[PDB]
Design an enzyme around this catalytic site. Structure first.
Site: not given
Ligand SMILES: Nc1ncnc2c1ncn2[C@@H]1O[C@H](COP(=O)(O)OP(=O)(O)O)[C@@H](O)[C@H]1O
Ligand SMILES: Nc1ncnc2c1ncn2[C@@H]1O[C@H](COP(=O)(O)OP(=O)(O)O)[C@@H](O)[C@H]1O
Ligand code: SF4
Ligand SMILES: [Mg+2]
Ligand SMILES: [Mg+2]
Lengths: 289, 289
Positions: B10, B15, B41, B129
């Site tokens: 998620k 991460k 990003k 997710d």
């Protein structure tokens, strides 16, 4: 009378609880409404129905063979205040787009007397942290008339908000996709409202309402219902009603204009959320700095 | 030597910080590694490079006209410990799949001497997710050998974890896609580790490591670097090293088997996270209950 309004926002913020309660308040003041659910779960429709999990279309796609075989009852039901819940359930997790499933789901409702009724509003509970073509596909259609972003004074609820607005940019010319307002669902960080108001007018919209974090929400949701019908006499209930007031009376619906990440970063550096990072220390070890 | 490992999970859990620091620890113990970034990003590669935002491929897709014109330098650079960062940047937000952009990005690296090197590991920082076909497309390929889910003892980090594992199910037969372990990035909720260990073996894997929430992470990231090179002498640094130890020595790699939502709900009802909901009160107003 019928306006097609989407409740966009990052996953987790307050979309499902906000929208179900808004609609409940709206239905309390005589408006006929339909709630559409697009989360990969049945949670977005739940509180009106009092059901643990409503039966989704994607779920009844295989449990009918062909999608064409389903009715209005088995796929959509009206719970409290005669407001019609329907869940999509996209996807079958691992293969295919979520939003392409969503689109074929509304297309069902598009070839039945679902929309065509004595309805005033339709609400699309849907995420957008990452707003990809898939999760930006009711904006490809003109299912996205009025877009309202639920968010909070935190990096990614807001980053998301700006990115939902980046998606209004793309389809703004080719149809009536507008940004109605911003809903700030409270985290309780001090001057949060202020931050969503700074960002609201930085984007050209207003922060139509500030929803508090009342614990009554929790007491109403263990009875699997909205705060509106649990205790109408509750303080948060009137907060939710207040939102619905501004929704129907809303006249401000703009095509936004996103800000750079530096503009979002400095906004949070202004309000104190993001750090005053020393450029003299970047790239250096602890024994020196 | 070369194992192709994905760091699923998620959005928000840990991460980027986990993976960059794992790899830094891994590189400290002589392993040659490449870090691939797929978040919309440049954040997933940042701490190794010390750059505010690395130059993504999707970004240099228009700033070259044709993707074919780009090199290995302008798209991928090695920062600290010679570990090669590369960012995809999918998508151009509003039109197209995120993961379909990711796939064409690795296909660039697939027709250059990027993979084919004296490399031991490649790490895919990516969300799940909602794991849609788009976000489940390195598992369509055999880019997803070893999958490790960073999560915490909370509803959606975990819901996500089960759903990443639902996606290993689909492609398990047709290629070597395995679930290596589970990383629990601490929230600090009391018996959190225990919950991720319950869920770990409920799924058939183990919870290979429990990462603490140390504030040193924040001190290292304002210097835009990993905790490993900020203070090697830090307690969390050895926690991060410890993870890398278990990674290389990992032999347990199973095809999981997901649990029902009732099984996840009761698990959290056992550990005390989810409520002991009275069925006698569901559907009723406050003046009675
Ligand atoms: N205004 C609020 N006050 C208190 N709790 C809230 C409020 N809005 C949402 N919540 C909490 O957040 C939870 C999840 O909200 P939800 O709207 O379902 O999230 P999401 O954005 O995914 O649709 C709610 O069930 C409740 O636990
Ligand atoms: N082990 C940790 N200890 C403390 N903070 C952490 C840790 N791991 C991650 N963080 C916090 O979580 C934030 C976001 O992590 P990130 O890895 O960037 O999230 P995501 O899962 O989206 O890639 C970090 O920048 C930091 O604020
Ligand atoms: S990233 Fe978006 S377009 Fe791509 S499969 Fe997912 S929902 Fe569909
Ligand atoms: Mg939801
Ligand atoms: Mg990330």
């Amino acid at each position: 009378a019928m306006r097609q309004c989407a409740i966009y926002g990052k996953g987790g913020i307050g979309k499902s609880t906000t929208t179900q309660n808004l609609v409940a308040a709206l239905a309390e003041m005589g408006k006929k409404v339909m709630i559409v659910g697009c989360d990969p779960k049945a949670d977005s429709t739940r509180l009106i129905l009092h059901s643990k999990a409503q039966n989704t279309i994607m779920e009844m796609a295989a449990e009918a063979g062909t999608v064409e075989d389903l009715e209005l009852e088995d796929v959509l039901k009206a719970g409290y205040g005669g407001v019609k819940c329907v869940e999509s359930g996209g996807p079958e997790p691992g293969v295919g787009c979520a939003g392409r499933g969503v689109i074929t789901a509304i297309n069902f409702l598009e070839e039945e007397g679902a929309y065509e009724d004595d309805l005033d509003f339709v609400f699309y509970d849907v995420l957008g942290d990452v707003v990809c073509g898939g999760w930006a596909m009711p904006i490809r259609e003109n299912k996205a008339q009025e877009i309202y972003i639920v968010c909070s004074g935190e990096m990614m609820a807001m980053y998301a908000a700006n990115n939902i607005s980046k998606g209004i940019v793309k389809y703004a010319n080719s149809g009536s996709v507008r940004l109605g307002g911003l809903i700030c669902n409270s985290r309780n960080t001090d001057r949060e409202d202020e931050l969503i108001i700074a960002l609201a007018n930085k984007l050209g919209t207003q922060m139509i309402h500030f929803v508090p974090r009342d614990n009554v929400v929790q007491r109403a949701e263990i009875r699997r219902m909205t705060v509106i019908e649990y205790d109408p006499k509750a303080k948060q209930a009137d907060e939710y009603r207040a939102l619905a007031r501004k929704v129907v009376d809303n006249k401000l619906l703009v095509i936004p204009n996103p800000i750079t990440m530096d503009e979002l970063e400095e906004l949070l550096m202004e309000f104190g959320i993001m750090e005053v990072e020393d450029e003299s220390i970047v790239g250096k070890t602890a024994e020196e700095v």
